[PDB]
Symmetry: C2
């Protein structure tokens, strides 16, 4: 990887990285915050997945994970949301809910997009291996957390479930996530375009997975989220876990007056960082 820029934040550094992805067939950007602990004298990683239209920079500047990262001793990674570029396909109608900035963390089967949109392998296979091979003391592969907002919240929950049998992720949280893509408009549009569905829908995945021990999924969502009722409906995961071993282990905190914005995100970042800090065995 190439170091594009370095910003000192808190007692550590935010590092803007770029590399040539074999998953996406393109140059990809990613930011990582290294905690004060890395520069002192293994540090686990949280992966934060971003929402529609977002770059790595958005969450990095607006969420203030860095303070929590120094508080508990974790690194945090902010990947991009799609392949980018002139030779990369985009939404044919110019919409922002599909195409560049809108991969939905899927491995594209459908022909035009299939060439670049291999976003599942990017996030879960290639990127952590690129980071480990670059920086390596940082654990990018074993002791790992996953989180995200909206589209990103989906990807986090999805990744946690699919990898659950191999304990791929040691904790999962989400902010205002899409829980049932098969049944929301952005989700449908995504699956149609990228795929042409079940192995990628959490509300279906969670039925077939035997819950373990104390494991749970922390969810936060605001009741003044303008997309809640039509596009998010995090509550349908609560329906899907009724009469399952996961019943009582998805807790959705519906929080009063809050938005879809990074004002909402930044508010509950501390509580989430704690949740992950616990599950990574840091406190």
């Amino acid at each position: 990887m190439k170091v594009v820029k370095e910003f000192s934040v808190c007692g550590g550094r935010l590092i803007k990285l770029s590399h040539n992805s074999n998953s996406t067939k393109t140059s990809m950007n990613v930011n990582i915050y290294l905690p004060k602990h890395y520069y002192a004298q293994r540090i686990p990683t949280v992966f934060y997945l971003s929402g529609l239209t977002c770059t790595p920079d958005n969450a990095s500047e607006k969420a203030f994970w860095q303070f929590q990262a120094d508080k508990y001793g974790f690194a945090i990674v902010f990947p991009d949301t799609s392949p980018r570029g002139d030779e990369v396909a985009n939404d044919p109608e110019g919409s922002w809910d599909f195409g560049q900035g809108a991969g939905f963390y899927l491995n594209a089967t459908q022909e035009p997009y299939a060439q670049h949109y291999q976003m599942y392998d990017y996030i879960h296979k290639e990127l952590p291996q690129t980071l480990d091979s670059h920086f390596n003391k940082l654990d990018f592969l074993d002791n790992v957390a996953i989180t995200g907002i909206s589209m990103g919240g989906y990807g986090a929950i999805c990744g946690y479930l699919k990898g659950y049998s191999g304990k791929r992720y040691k904790s999962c949280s989400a902010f205002a996530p899409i829980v049932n893509p098969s049944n929301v408009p952005w989700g449908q549009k995504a699956f149609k375009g990228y795929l042409g569905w079940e192995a990628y829908d959490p509300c279906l995945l969670i039925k077939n997975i035997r819950h373990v021990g104390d494991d749970r999924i922390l969810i936060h969502v605001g009741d003044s989220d303008p997309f809640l009722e039509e596009h998010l409906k995090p509550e349908l995961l609560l329906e899907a876990v009724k009469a399952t071993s996961w019943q009582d282990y998805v807790e959705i905190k519906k929080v009063h007056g809050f938005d879809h914005s990074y004002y909402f995100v930044s508010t509950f970042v501390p509580e989430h960082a704690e949740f992950h800090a616990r599950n990574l065995g840091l406190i």
Copy 2:
């Protein structure tokens, strides 16, 4: 004063406001964060933004809200100039003069004179407009002033000019311009807005102001700020006070590896909040 939009942040709210200003003869946007305490004499901090910025940049990237909740203060984020097709702009299209770039002066030079009464806007008009619309918050008596770059300049300047009447009770700045008469952006601003100066330059102003008590200006600046050597030159304020009673009451903390970015601001917002909280008598 019209409410443009509210957002719940931490245990309070940030409100994007707009009003018709007498100072500027224009509609102006202001963001204010009301802490947990106002929904449970609340003092107010005014944060002045740098070149090109709107009230939004600081609101989203500095994370004052957690601190405002912590100590019990309101914080106000005014805009940096009048705005609009009718309001004069830089004749060459530069970002350091004109729109986004009022330098907190009361302009005398003719085109800009119709609109750019930014010193009046900030110190005379706005806190009174806020006091009408909201009022107990204190927008007038127990108030602190701070800012970044152009805004840091504004904060020091406002603090000093009213120092004898105790206009503001606490002053700090992040990477300010301290000596506009000798840095390119300031020289351009003065020529452009006023023609001919002294009454707006802190380095000249401080020569004639009787220091008292343990009053002091806290300044942070990063040694990796690319604007340091040419445009800012805070140390000039330190040498300025060598002649005066202010000797030992301006402290510049030049911190290693830090930027001009809001990664820099957010890092030291916590200390600056404590500084103000102490001066406002909240702790």
